[PDB]
Scaffold this active site. Structure first.
Site, PDB file in Angstrom:
ATOM      1  N   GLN C  11       0.662  -0.746   0.367  1.00 27.55           N
ATOM      2  CA  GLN C  11       0.238   0.541   0.187  1.00 27.55           C
ATOM      3  C   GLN C  11       1.078   0.829  -0.467  1.00 27.55           C
ATOM      4  OE1 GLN C  11      -2.701   0.330   3.403  1.00 27.55           O
ATOM      5  NE2 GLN C  11      -3.580   2.066   2.330  1.00 27.55           N
ATOM      6  N   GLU C  62      -4.847  -6.230  -1.105  1.00 23.94           N
ATOM      7  CA  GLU C  62      -6.153  -5.599  -1.014  1.00 23.94           C
ATOM      8  C   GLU C  62      -6.052  -5.335  -1.553  1.00 23.94           C
ATOM      9  OE1 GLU C  62      -3.148  -5.020   1.121  1.00 23.94           O
ATOM     10  OE2 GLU C  62      -2.963  -3.238   1.641  1.00 23.94           O
ATOM     11  N   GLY C 135       2.757  -6.691   5.449  1.00 22.92           N
ATOM     12  CA  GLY C 135       2.909  -7.828   4.751  1.00 22.92           C
ATOM     13  C   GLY C 135       3.075  -8.131   3.383  1.00 22.92           C
ATOM     14  N   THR C 136       1.937  -7.596   2.747  1.00 19.55           N
ATOM     15  CA  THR C 136       2.334  -7.688   1.332  1.00 19.55           C
ATOM     16  C   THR C 136       3.935  -7.031   0.610  1.00 19.55           C
ATOM     17  OG1 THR C 136       1.826  -7.627  -1.367  1.00 19.55           O
ATOM     18  CG2 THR C 136       1.404  -5.620   0.938  1.00 19.55           C
ATOM     19  N   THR C 170       3.378   2.816  13.755  1.00 19.85           N
ATOM     20  CA  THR C 170       1.599   2.205  13.558  1.00 19.85           C
ATOM     21  C   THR C 170       1.153   0.879  13.365  1.00 19.85           C
ATOM     22  OG1 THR C 170       1.736   2.889  11.396  1.00 19.85           O
ATOM     23  CG2 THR C 170       1.407   4.400  13.172  1.00 19.85           C
ATOM     24  N   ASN C 197       9.522   6.747   8.212  1.00 18.45           N
ATOM     25  CA  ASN C 197       8.558   7.935   8.042  1.00 18.45           C
ATOM     26  C   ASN C 197       8.787   8.975   9.202  1.00 18.45           C
ATOM     27  OD1 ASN C 197       7.461   6.274   6.186  1.00 18.45           O
ATOM     28  ND2 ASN C 197       4.944   6.102   6.708  1.00 18.45           N
ATOM     29  N   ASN C 219       4.872  11.382   0.929  1.00 22.05           N
ATOM     30  CA  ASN C 219       5.345  10.808  -0.442  1.00 22.05           C
ATOM     31  C   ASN C 219       6.153  11.533  -1.381  1.00 22.05           C
ATOM     32  OD1 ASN C 219       4.139   8.958   0.747  1.00 22.05           O
ATOM     33  ND2 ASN C 219       2.213   8.797  -0.918  1.00 22.05           N
ATOM     34  N   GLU C 245      26.685   3.977 -12.229  1.00 23.30           N
ATOM     35  CA  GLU C 245      27.918   4.468 -11.780  1.00 23.30           C
ATOM     36  C   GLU C 245      27.341   4.607 -10.422  1.00 23.30           C
ATOM     37  OE1 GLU C 245      30.700   5.865 -14.432  1.00 23.30           O
ATOM     38  OE2 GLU C 245      30.360   6.406 -11.946  1.00 23.30           O
TER      39      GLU C 245
HETATM   40  N1  LIG Z   1       6.003   6.308   3.218  1.00 16.63           N
HETATM   41  C1  LIG Z   1       4.664   5.786   3.503  1.00 16.63           C
HETATM   42  N2  LIG Z   1       4.218   5.082   4.455  1.00 16.63           N
HETATM   43  C2  LIG Z   1       3.459   4.073   4.666  1.00 16.63           C
HETATM   44  C3  LIG Z   1       1.825   4.740   4.248  1.00 16.63           C
HETATM   45  N3  LIG Z   1       1.100   4.332   4.655  1.00 16.63           N
HETATM   46  C4  LIG Z   1       1.528   4.047   5.205  1.00 16.63           C
HETATM   47  N4  LIG Z   1       3.327   3.537   5.256  1.00 16.63           N
HETATM   48  C5  LIG Z   1       4.106   2.691   6.605  1.00 16.63           C
HETATM   49  O1  LIG Z   1       3.764   1.127   6.043  1.00 16.63           O
HETATM   50  C6  LIG Z   1       4.100   0.823   7.035  1.00 16.63           C
HETATM   51  C7  LIG Z   1       2.891  -0.277   7.387  1.00 16.63           C
HETATM   52  O2  LIG Z   1       2.487  -0.820   6.387  1.00 16.63           O
HETATM   53  P1  LIG Z   1       2.408  -1.104   5.436  1.00 16.63           P
HETATM   54  O3  LIG Z   1       2.362  -0.261   3.861  1.00 16.63           O
HETATM   55  O4  LIG Z   1       0.353  -0.512   5.570  1.00 16.63           O
HETATM   56  O5  LIG Z   1       2.062  -2.678   4.756  1.00 16.63           O
HETATM   57  P2  LIG Z   1       1.701  -3.066   3.067  1.00 16.63           P
HETATM   58  O6  LIG Z   1       2.713  -2.998   2.240  1.00 16.63           O
HETATM   59  O7  LIG Z   1       0.453  -2.640   2.926  1.00 16.63           O
HETATM   60  O8  LIG Z   1       1.310  -4.578   3.315  1.00 16.63           O
HETATM   61  P3  LIG Z   1       0.311  -5.116   4.771  1.00 16.63           P
HETATM   62  O9  LIG Z   1       0.149  -4.939   5.905  1.00 16.63           O
HETATM   63  O10 LIG Z   1      -0.027  -6.735   4.283  1.00 16.63           O
HETATM   64  O11 LIG Z   1      -1.367  -4.300   3.858  1.00 16.63           O
HETATM   65  C8  LIG Z   1       3.781   1.977   8.780  1.00 16.63           C
HETATM   66  O12 LIG Z   1       4.886   1.875   9.312  1.00 16.63           O
HETATM   67  C9  LIG Z   1       3.822   3.397   7.582  1.00 16.63           C
HETATM   68  O13 LIG Z   1       5.044   4.061   8.377  1.00 16.63           O
HETATM   69  C10 LIG Z   1       1.897   5.779   2.612  1.00 16.63           C
HETATM   70  O14 LIG Z   1       0.778   6.470   2.223  1.00 16.63           O
HETATM   71  N5  LIG Z   1       4.146   6.056   2.720  1.00 16.63           N
HETATM   72 MG   LIG Z   2      -0.562  -3.901   2.271  1.00 18.64          MG
END
Ligand SMILES: Nc1nc2c(ncn2[C@@H]2O[C@H](COP(=O)(O)OP(=O)(O)OP(=O)(O)O)[C@@H](O)[C@H]2O)c(=O)[nH]1
Ligand SMILES: [Mg+2]
Ligand SMILES: Nc1nc2c(ncn2[C@@H]2O[C@H](COP(=O)(O)OP(=O)(O)OP(=O)(O)O)[C@@H](O)[C@H]2O)c(=O)[nH]1
Ligand SMILES: Nc1nc2c(ncn2[C@@H]2O[C@H](COP(=O)(O)OP(=O)(O)O)[C@@H](O)[C@H]2O)c(=O)[nH]1
Ligand SMILES: Nc1nc2c(ncn2[C@@H]2O[C@H](COP(=O)(O)OP(=O)(O)O)[C@@H](O)[C@H]2O)c(=O)[nH]1
Ligand SMILES: [Mg+2]
Ligand SMILES: [Mg+2]
Lengths: 426, 37, 428, 426, 428
Positions: C11, C62, C135-136, C170, C197, C219, C245
């Site tokens: 995500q 998802e 997770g993913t 989180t 973050n 982002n 490089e």
């Molecule tokens: N840079 C950035 N980091 C994010 C964002 N949303 C969530 N995160 C980071 O992602 C971490 C949680 O992992 P996710 O990216 O939500 O997990 P995922 O890759 O979506 O995989 P799943 O948990 O299975 O849904 C949190 O600690 C956030 O710091 C975003 O929109 N931008």
């Molecule tokens: Mg995910």
């Protein structure tokens, strides 16, 4: 009757020699379409050294453009004076040599070297007798240091009689870029000692040193410091290109500046140079060009000539001048400053006089000298090399693409003994 | 477009600097072997 | 011919990939529908009547944040097979994403990466963006790198992660996702950059003055790092630094490939036209030990190599002075087997203003990616959290149920433990 | 032929000498563009003593501007006759000399003296032989005193046979700007005896005093003083640059005015001086030139010379005049004024005729005398130095950059030795 | 090249600097937004297109004055973080402003000094403004002088502080605060000048005939002193006096640098027309014990050094005439070990009058900065105040409860006591 074939390799090599073909063009009246404007017998009678005919009257340069990327050779072509070079003499390569010496020398440059050697054999061997080759490259990247020395090795075995003059750009390490400068520099030096007749050492910091404390520029750009290099490249081959009172040749420089074949690394310089608000304040005579051709900063390498001795030296004067002054001033620097001049060679000076001065100026002069102070350049790269080498630094790129460990120790040996051979004559 | 090169064909640089000056408002008199006007 | 394939999994990878693909698309000038009203070849193909299509592969399990891509303004720019989705998510579970629900979307991803790589006349690298801690992104992403290394070898796999931040995370089960995803990030990754973050929050709250930043503003600054890192791929400059490089001057030894980011001409309106932003000013703020994008303060670390990528109207001699004044500063220390420790690149294209954004017009920028022994603390911080949670086997019944044994946990803590050990032996 | 290098340091040295280069341009015909506006070879035949040909025909003054502040020496360029000076004979340097001798001679003058020895060497060695040097500097300040003293010791060991003629301005007792002026004066004097061939004391009290009692001014200003010094400055050199009945080079001044090597401190006076009241109303023949130069309210020092003797004394005359009138009027001086002259050597008066008058006058005169009354300048500065040094006034500055307490005690003891040497001949 | 970074700390320092920058922007020709329609180099920077941000650092612990500049007419003149401010004030306590809450703002204080001094080339001096008779003026006035001394050596640190008044002090803990200031401005301030409010009160009442002046009507005379003293640093003059001049002719011993100031002619419009403004009478009206900006008549002491800064259309002949008539007049004394003692710096540029202020358009003015042994009285009137208050331990529980250890009152009194015993030692 005698021809110089220019081969430029690397981002540094292509950009420097693009200025070199720009300054040779307006020294020869060549418009950037090949046409010749301005009427003079002397500006075409010896143009076969750098240009050939094209049965359309177009004077085409002897350029063998090379870099392992469709990068700066696109900017050279698209820029001014870029239509002169043949599109055939633009060997590209698309894989890329990422500042790695073994890339240009062993594993990517070995599949394009068979085409640029075909090009240079088509363009240089197709005449009666070529005088030699002129190679422009930097020993700091991957293309100039890697592919450049690979062609240097192949040319010296195919033509083991001709003069290869190489305007190498050594990595000046006080202020520089890329972290692999000592690896690319030392891995090329142990080849340039054997198969290279002349190596003019150029450092970028000394080009900034002229651009700050001699020309008083605001922002010294890469184009300005490539213009100063092209001044020395044109000035050395002046007698080969124009008549004069005391003609010379690249072999006359070689026989009067190489006491022993390994010691051929020269300090180059060129200065009837002046600031912007001082050309109407400064005169122009043989003593004034002399005092700005030995002094401290006119050298285009960052090696102080006072920190050493001159094994031998030469001076390529240009323009209308008295032959008494061009002899007496070389005597005057010889006997006044005797500590910075070796004694087991007596009277260490060559002078040589062109009759045609460069464009705009009334008289110019270029230095090439075999000062033993060049040991402080190989030492300033060795102390950086052995620092990285003791803990096996950025190396898995070099070893991973086909270099054993013995090549790096052999690189240290032939460059440590080069400093030691300069010690015996200081 | 690459940055412009500032050096002529005669290897004299093209466009000059200005010194960062110091308020050239002065006053002028005369006594030049004649004593004031 | 220069061509980088972006693979955004998770995500967070989709969302940071959104802000990235507009410094790629309409910085090259192409409209939302996909028409310019060949610099685009770094990120785009071309399909006839001026249609350039992004060279991206969007992966998620998802179908809700990638469905926002299918329904947003930019639905007709992406091809409707480049936005690969699934039926059910991975739920911070590394074993689900890698062993159970990963092996039905990975066969579609490798098809799209195949069709986007045989449309290549020389692929520079796979710029895969993920979020370690989920997770993913930690699961499917790890399996994607293992499959990509076996088939598509010898060409680079630059990975910018979203490694779990020290305090703010989180989640609760992210140490299991981070430590067990270390194996892919240590072997099947050519360049890894830690990018959490909290540090983006700190940059936004100190320089950029947005005291309430959202993930969309996070982002932003991630995207400006990416555009400056591939700036010399597409635009001319005095010195170019392509992805070959990049890795050859920043990776001393093959196992150590972890780096830090900083893109600090971070200015915004009131703090923009008042401050003279010269080359010396932006370089000092890039090396400043609070604009590091990892909460990874290098004052207690040893610098190894730096990759300052000046971008704009930067003069090369001003680069030379800026490097010199960093070297003379004592708290910026370098390891002794590296006298030359900078790879300076210069782009000519200036950075781009943001309408409705956070930055402004700036004529020059720096984006330095630096390897240091200071990066050994972002893994030792999470060594504490993994050791506490795995003591009495919390959350383990989840991870063991769908197909990994409990010994995966111990070997991944071993892979982490052999990881920090290699940093202090290099530094000393 | 002969040449003179005009070294000038400090705000006083640069402003006074810029007025000198104004007057010598108006007297040689140099226009304020570098050309020649007059039409007579009796001006231009010896422009090669203060100028150098500069290709285009432009006569660049042979001066070395030097200041350890980019202040008033930038203001020299702003004014008229300010673009004649060559821009790389400008020794800049940001730093900033607080009024302090050890900043000029130990800490900040040292990093800046290596550039100015280079500029002096490039000019002096460019010719065969020069007649000597000429230095204008201020004892009271820091950059003129402390740095100018170190240069005149460096060029003494470089050329230990050319003259060191120093148009130095001494601190004034009544007119007292700068608090630490007696310290910087005393530290300057004790090396100025051992490294300067001729010293010419120009006190600013008498430069004021000339203006409002003989010139009858209303607002005496600094430009007025610098012209009074400069008329003397051409009035000691014109026998070189211009022909004459009885020529006199500056070494002829040296041997005829220095009975003993340590005593060389002179007093000058240039007196065809008048006002607007009497510029019509005044004869300007010979006998009153000698009446005005041998007059107490005329010498350029607050060193009233009736209170002393006149060991040696030269009077270099100018203008259309006869050799008998100069001789019999100065014999008249030696006759009637007998008590104030010295008795153990005969004919304490030197004749020399410079046949070209200055511009606007038909004849002139410049008197340089070695009066023993100069010891009361050394008595007033020693009085101020001992008044401060008893209670260690303002010394934490001077010991800060590494000049010891003992350096003041040889400074006072050597300056007392000059008082005693000027006393034993009286 | 020549340039002065000015650090104002404390509420008195802010409004003094507000008058200082009102005069500096008006004299040099910078609009309130920072636009002209090398003299800007001595006090301002140079931004993108014709902008000049002041090289000033406003620092305070209370927020009510700093944000009033941000919401005032000179909002866009300043880059909006050199005006740093805390959330709570120092409560007229040295212990609070130096040991507890000044520590969390001094890091932001020096960080802004770094960024304001990296772009500068050849800094001439730190010109500090504070009130030692206050909380944050005394407290952070100490804390910045310790931190700038340990980091920035060599370079001069002037301090134009405001000493507590003998009679009208507007505080009750005013002798505790500036006894503890003495540890700061003795061995860490290069040159310190006394400017207390009851003296400019008497100057405004007597010369300008303002019966009821405010703080603004004092601060504009204070700005006239800063303009005259840094005048040779920015405008061309006949004799040049910079900061290095200002310390080497005028500070005899390392531990005697406490000073007084005097200005003339401070004359209004209705009086300046009916009077000559000449070089002679502005000097004898300057060496007069009612134009001193401290209640300290010089007849009760002996002068040691004087630094007349003549500024205007002054001919240098009449300056020496004024010095001559001062070498007469046996009322004015001079110490025996300094036979000289007049550093006269002459400028050319006439004074800049503020439209709607209270000075007429004068053509010439002089600024005394003098050192005398009479200035021991400025501390000696205070010795009664500290003994009478420290006797039965009044107002002590604030200081010792804050974190400042007990006993520090005694050696701050002993350092102050050794200051007087140095002054009658040098005056004999
Ligand atoms: N840079 C950035 N980091 C994010 C964002 N949303 C969530 N995160 C980071 O992602 C971490 C949680 O992992 P996710 O990216 O939500 O997990 P995922 O890759 O979506 O995989 P799943 O948990 O299975 O849904 C949190 O600690 C956030 O710091 C975003 O929109 N931008
Ligand atoms: Mg995910
Ligand atoms: N010249 C001048 N002096 C002032 C001004 N305001 C206050 N003072 C003096 O400062 C003294 C007290 O210090 P303040 O500046 O008011 O308080 P502070 O230094 O900010 O410290 P705090 O008590 O924490 O606010 C008073 O006795 C006043 O005499 C002003 O605007 N101009
Ligand atoms: N004089 C000059 N030097 C250059 C230029 N471009 C790059 N360099 C220098 O060359 C070094 C990099 O090597 P380069 O030749 O560009 O890499 P290559 O293309 O792989 O051979 C750097 O240290 C640069 O300072 C140029 O145009 N002129
Ligand atoms: N004749 C003359 N005297 C000057 C001039 N400028 C300053 N002075 C005097 O010299 C003293 C100052 O010396 P200064 O130039 O500051 O010395 P520096 O600091 O080393 O340059 C003052 O007492 C002035 O009266 C000038 O242009 N001409
Ligand atoms: Mg003779
Ligand atoms: Mg306060």
């Amino acid at each position: 009757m005698r021809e110089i074939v220019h081969v430029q390799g690397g981002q540094c090599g292509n950009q420097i020699g693009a200025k070199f073909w720009e300054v040779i063009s307006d020294e020869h009246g060549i418009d950037p379409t090949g046409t010749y404007c301005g009427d003079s017998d002397l500006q075409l009678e010896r143009i076969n050294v750098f240009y050939n005919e094209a049965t359309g009257g177009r004077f085409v340069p002897r350029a063998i453009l090379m870099d392992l990327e469709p990068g700066t050779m696109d900017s050279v072509r698209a820029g001014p004076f870029g239509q002169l070079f043949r599109p055939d003499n633009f060997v590209f390569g698309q894989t890329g040599a990422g500042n790695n010496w073994a890339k240009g020398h062993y594993t990517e440059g070995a599949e394009l070297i068979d085409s640029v050697l075909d090009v240079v054999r088509k363009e240089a061997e197709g005449c009666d007798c070529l005088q030699g080759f002129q190679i422009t490259h930097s020993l700091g990247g991957g293309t100039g240091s890697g592919m450049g020395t690979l062609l240097i090795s192949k040319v010296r075995e195919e033509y083991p009689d001709r003069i290869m003059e190489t305007f190498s750009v050594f990595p000046s390490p006080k202020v520089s870029d890329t972290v692999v400068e000592p690896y690319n520099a030392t891995l090329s030096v142990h080849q340039l000692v054997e198969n290279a007749d002349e190596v003019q050492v150029i450092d970028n910091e000394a080009l900034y040193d002229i651009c700050f404390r001699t020309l008083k520029l605001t922002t010294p750009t890469y184009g300005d410091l490539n213009h100063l290099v092209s001044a020395a490249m044109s000035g050395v081959t002046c007698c080969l290109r124009f008549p004069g009172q005391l003609n010379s040749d690249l072999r006359k420089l070689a026989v009067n500046l190489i006491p022993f074949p390994r010691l051929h690394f020269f300090l180059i310089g060129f200065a009837p140079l002046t600031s912007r608000g001082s050309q109407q304040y400064r005169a122009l005579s043989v003593p004034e060009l002399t005092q700005q051709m030995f002094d401290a900063k006119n050298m285009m390498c960052a090696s102080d000539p006072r920190h050493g001795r001159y094994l031998t030296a030469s001076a390529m004067f240009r323009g209308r001048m008295s032959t008494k002054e061009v002899d007496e001033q070389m005597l005057n620097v010889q006997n006044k400053n005797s500590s910075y001049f070796v004694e087991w060679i007596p009277n260490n000076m060559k002078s040589s006089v062109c009759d045609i001065p460069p464009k705009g100026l009334k008289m110019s002069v270029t230095f090439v000298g075999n000062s033993t102070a060049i040991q402080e350049m190989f030492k300033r790269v060795s102390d950086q090399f052995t620092a990285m080498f003791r803990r096996k630094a950025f190396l898995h790129w070099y070893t991973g693409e086909g270099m054993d460990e013995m090549e790096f120790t052999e690189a240290e040996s032939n460059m440590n003994d080069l400093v030691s051979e300069y010690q015996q004559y200081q | 477009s690459p940055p412009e090169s500032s050096l002529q064909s005669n290897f004299v640089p093209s466009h000059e600097e200005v010194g960062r000056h110091k308020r050239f408002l002065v006053n002028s008199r005369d006594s030049l072997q004649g004593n004031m006007i | 011919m220069r061509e980088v394939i972006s693979i955004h999994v998770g995500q967070a990878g989709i969302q940071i990939g959104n802000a990235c693909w507009e410094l790629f698309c309409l910085e090259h000038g192409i409209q939302p529908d996909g028409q310019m009203p060949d610099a685009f070849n770094t990120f785009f193909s071309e399909t006839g009547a001026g249609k350039h299509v992004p060279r991206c592969v969007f992966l998620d399990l998802e179908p809700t944040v990638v469905d926002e891509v299918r329904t947003g303004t930019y639905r007709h720019l992406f091809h409707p097979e480049q936005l690969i989705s699934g039926k059910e998510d991975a739920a911070n579970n590394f074993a689900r994403g890698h062993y159970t629900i990963g092996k039905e979307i990975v066969d579609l991803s490798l098809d799209r990466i195949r069709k986007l790589a045989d449309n290549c006349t020389g692929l520079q690298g796979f710029l895969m963006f993920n979020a370690v801690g989920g997770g993913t992104g930690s699961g499917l992403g790890c399996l994607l790198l293992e499959r990509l290394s076996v088939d598509y070898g010898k060409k680079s796999k630059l990975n910018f992660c979203s490694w779990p931040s020290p305090q703010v995370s989180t989640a609760v089960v992210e140490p299991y996702n981070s430590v067990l995803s270390t194996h892919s990030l240590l072997e099947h990754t050519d360049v890894a950059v830690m990018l959490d973050n909290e540090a983006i929050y700190d940059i936004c709250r100190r320089n950029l003055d947005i005291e309430r930043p959202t993930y969309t503003n996070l982002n932003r600054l991630i995207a400006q790092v990416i555009s400056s890192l591939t700036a010399s791929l597409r635009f001319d400059g005095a010195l170019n630094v392509d992805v070959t490089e990049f890795q050859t001057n920043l990776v001393p030894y093959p196992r150590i490939h972890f780096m830090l980011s900083s893109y600090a001409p971070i200015i915004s309106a009131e703090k923009a036209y008042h401050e003279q932003l010269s080359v010396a000013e932006i370089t000092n703020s890039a090396f400043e030990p609070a604009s590091m994008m990892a909460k990874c303060d290098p004052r207690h670390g040893k610098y190894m190599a730096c990759c300052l990528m000046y971008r704009g109207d930067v003069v090369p001699k001003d680069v030379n002075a800026a490097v010199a004044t960093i070297k003379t500063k004592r708290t910026i220390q370098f390891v002794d087997w590296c006298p030359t420790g900078f790879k300076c690149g210069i782009n000519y294209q200036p950075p781009t203003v943001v309408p409705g954004g956070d930055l402004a017009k700036v004529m020059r920028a720096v984006c330095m990616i630096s390897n240091s022994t200071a990066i050994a603390e972002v893994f030792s911080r999470m060594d504490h959290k993994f050791d506490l949670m795995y003591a009495k086997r919390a959350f383990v019944h989840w991870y063991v149920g769908e197909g990994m044994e409990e010994g995966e946990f111990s070997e991944a803590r071993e892979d982490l433990a052999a990881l920090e050990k290699d940093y202090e032996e290099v530094g000393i």
